[PDB]
Protease 2A (Coxsackievirus A16), 140 residues
Amino acid sequence: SGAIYVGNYRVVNRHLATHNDWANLVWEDSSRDLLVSSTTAQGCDTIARCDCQTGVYYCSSRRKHYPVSFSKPSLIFVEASEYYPARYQSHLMLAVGHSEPGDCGGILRCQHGVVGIVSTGGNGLVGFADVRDLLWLDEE
Ligand SMILES: NC(=O)[C@H]1CCC(=O)N(Cc2cc(Cl)c3c[nH]nc3c2)C1
Ligand SMILES: [Zn+2]
Protein backbone atom coordinates (compact mmCIF):
# COMPACT_ATOMS: atom_id res chain seq x y z
CA SER A 1 0.00 0.00 0.00
CA GLY A 2 1.00 3.65 -0.37
CA ALA A 3 0.10 6.99 -1.91
CA ILE A 4 1.74 10.33 -2.91
CA TYR A 5 -0.05 13.41 -1.41
CA VAL A 6 0.82 16.52 -3.48
CA GLY A 7 -1.33 19.66 -3.25
CA ASN A 8 -4.98 18.65 -3.56
CA TYR A 9 -4.08 15.28 -5.17
CA ARG A 10 -3.69 11.66 -4.06
CA VAL A 11 -1.65 9.38 -6.38
CA VAL A 12 -2.16 5.62 -6.00
CA ASN A 13 -1.59 2.35 -7.94
CA ARG A 14 -4.73 2.13 -10.17
CA HIS A 15 -5.31 -1.49 -8.98
CA LEU A 16 -5.50 -0.22 -5.33
CA ALA A 17 -7.76 2.87 -5.80
CA THR A 18 -10.82 3.16 -3.46
CA HIS A 19 -14.52 4.25 -4.07
CA ASN A 20 -13.69 7.85 -2.97
CA ASP A 21 -10.81 7.86 -5.50
CA TRP A 22 -13.00 6.73 -8.47
CA ALA A 23 -15.80 9.15 -7.36
CA ASN A 24 -13.27 12.02 -7.04
CA LEU A 25 -11.24 10.93 -10.10
CA VAL A 26 -8.99 13.49 -11.74
CA TRP A 27 -6.94 11.24 -14.12
CA GLU A 28 -6.19 7.52 -14.58
CA ASP A 29 -4.19 5.35 -17.01
CA SER A 30 -4.58 1.57 -16.90
CA SER A 31 -1.42 1.15 -19.04
CA ARG A 32 0.61 3.10 -16.38
CA ASP A 33 -1.10 1.42 -13.31
CA LEU A 34 -1.74 5.04 -12.08
CA LEU A 35 -4.79 6.86 -10.68
CA VAL A 36 -5.00 10.36 -9.28
CA SER A 37 -7.96 11.57 -7.20
CA SER A 38 -8.79 14.92 -5.46
CA THR A 39 -8.42 15.52 -1.70
CA THR A 40 -9.84 18.02 0.80
CA ALA A 41 -6.53 18.65 2.63
CA GLN A 42 -3.27 19.86 1.09
CA GLY A 43 -0.50 17.26 0.92
CA CYS A 44 3.13 17.74 1.89
CA ASP A 45 4.88 15.69 -0.86
CA THR A 46 7.03 17.31 -3.59
CA ILE A 47 7.29 15.69 -7.07
CA ALA A 48 10.85 15.48 -8.45
CA ARG A 49 11.33 17.26 -11.85
CA CYS A 50 14.62 15.69 -13.04
CA ASP A 51 16.26 12.75 -14.96
CA CYS A 52 17.79 11.01 -11.87
CA GLN A 53 18.66 7.33 -12.26
CA THR A 54 19.61 6.84 -8.53
CA GLY A 55 17.42 7.14 -5.45
CA VAL A 56 15.90 5.34 -2.46
CA TYR A 57 12.63 3.31 -2.24
CA TYR A 58 10.54 1.96 0.66
CA CYS A 59 10.06 -1.83 0.79
CA SER A 60 7.25 -2.76 3.25
CA SER A 61 7.98 -6.53 2.98
CA ARG A 62 11.46 -5.78 4.50
CA ARG A 63 10.49 -2.58 6.58
CA LYS A 64 13.58 -1.02 4.90
CA HIS A 65 14.55 1.90 2.61
CA TYR A 66 16.94 0.67 -0.12
CA PRO A 67 19.27 2.84 -2.25
CA VAL A 68 18.89 1.86 -5.97
CA SER A 69 20.00 2.58 -9.56
CA PHE A 70 16.96 2.47 -11.90
CA SER A 71 16.36 2.53 -15.65
CA LYS A 72 14.63 5.29 -17.72
CA PRO A 73 10.78 5.21 -18.00
CA SER A 74 9.94 2.70 -20.78
CA LEU A 75 7.20 0.40 -22.25
CA ILE A 76 7.91 -2.94 -20.52
CA PHE A 77 6.07 -6.30 -20.78
CA VAL A 78 4.29 -7.35 -17.56
CA GLU A 79 3.01 -10.88 -16.69
CA ALA A 80 -0.68 -11.61 -15.93
CA SER A 81 -1.90 -10.84 -12.37
CA GLU A 82 -5.20 -10.82 -10.31
CA TYR A 83 -5.60 -7.15 -11.42
CA TYR A 84 -4.55 -7.13 -15.10
CA PRO A 85 -4.09 -9.73 -17.90
CA ALA A 86 -0.54 -10.11 -19.47
CA ARG A 87 0.27 -6.66 -21.09
CA TYR A 88 2.77 -3.78 -21.76
CA GLN A 89 2.98 -1.19 -18.94
CA SER A 90 4.25 2.26 -20.05
CA HIS A 91 6.45 4.78 -18.06
CA LEU A 92 8.03 1.93 -16.08
CA MET A 93 11.48 1.95 -14.43
CA LEU A 94 13.26 -1.20 -13.19
CA ALA A 95 15.96 -1.71 -10.47
CA VAL A 96 17.65 -4.74 -8.93
CA GLY A 97 15.84 -4.86 -5.60
CA HIS A 98 13.42 -6.88 -3.49
CA SER A 99 9.66 -6.52 -3.99
CA GLU A 100 6.41 -8.39 -3.39
CA PRO A 101 2.86 -7.46 -4.56
CA GLY A 102 2.01 -5.83 -1.20
CA ASP A 103 4.96 -3.44 -1.72
CA CYS A 104 2.98 -1.50 -4.43
CA GLY A 105 2.57 2.11 -3.38
CA GLY A 106 6.05 2.34 -1.78
CA ILE A 107 7.68 5.63 -2.74
CA LEU A 108 10.88 5.94 -4.81
CA ARG A 109 12.64 9.23 -4.11
CA CYS A 110 15.74 11.22 -5.18
CA GLN A 111 17.33 14.54 -3.88
CA HIS A 112 14.56 16.50 -5.69
CA GLY A 113 11.49 14.70 -4.38
CA VAL A 114 9.16 11.84 -5.22
CA VAL A 115 10.07 10.02 -8.51
CA GLY A 116 7.36 7.28 -8.50
CA ILE A 117 5.77 4.34 -6.66
CA VAL A 118 6.37 0.50 -6.66
CA SER A 119 4.07 -1.04 -9.33
CA THR A 120 5.77 -4.30 -10.53
CA GLY A 121 8.29 -6.93 -9.35
CA GLY A 122 9.69 -10.43 -9.49
CA ASN A 123 12.94 -12.40 -9.59
CA GLY A 124 15.05 -9.77 -7.77
CA LEU A 125 13.73 -6.86 -9.84
CA VAL A 126 11.42 -4.00 -8.74
CA GLY A 127 9.45 -1.73 -11.07
CA PHE A 128 8.30 1.81 -10.36
CA ALA A 129 5.56 3.77 -12.15
CA ASP A 130 7.17 7.17 -12.92
CA VAL A 131 5.25 10.39 -11.99
CA ARG A 132 7.88 13.11 -12.96
CA ASP A 133 6.25 13.78 -16.38
CA LEU A 134 2.84 14.66 -14.72
CA LEU A 135 3.63 18.40 -14.52
CA TRP A 136 -0.01 19.33 -13.67
CA LEU A 137 0.47 17.68 -10.22
CA ASP A 138 2.36 20.99 -9.31
CA GLU A 139 -0.62 23.24 -10.17
CA GLU A 140 -4.40 23.90 -9.60
N1 LIG B 1 1.42 -3.24 -12.19
C1 LIG B 1 1.05 -4.51 -12.28
O1 LIG B 1 0.75 -5.05 -13.35
C2 LIG B 1 0.99 -5.28 -10.97
C3 LIG B 1 -0.44 -5.31 -10.41
C4 LIG B 1 -0.49 -5.97 -9.03
C5 LIG B 1 0.29 -7.26 -8.92
O2 LIG B 1 0.04 -8.05 -8.02
N2 LIG B 1 1.23 -7.51 -9.88
C6 LIG B 1 2.01 -8.74 -9.80
C7 LIG B 1 3.33 -8.62 -9.07
C8 LIG B 1 3.71 -7.42 -8.47
C9 LIG B 1 4.87 -7.36 -7.71
CL1 LIG B 1 5.33 -5.83 -7.02
C10 LIG B 1 5.69 -8.47 -7.50
C11 LIG B 1 6.88 -8.80 -6.80
N3 LIG B 1 7.12 -10.07 -7.09
N4 LIG B 1 6.22 -10.66 -7.90
C12 LIG B 1 5.32 -9.67 -8.15
C13 LIG B 1 4.14 -9.74 -8.93
C14 LIG B 1 1.50 -6.73 -11.09
ZN1 LIG C 1 16.13 13.70 -9.21
Q: What stands out?
A: The pocket of zinc ion (ligand 2) is lined by residues 48, 50, 52, 110-112 (CB under 6 Å).
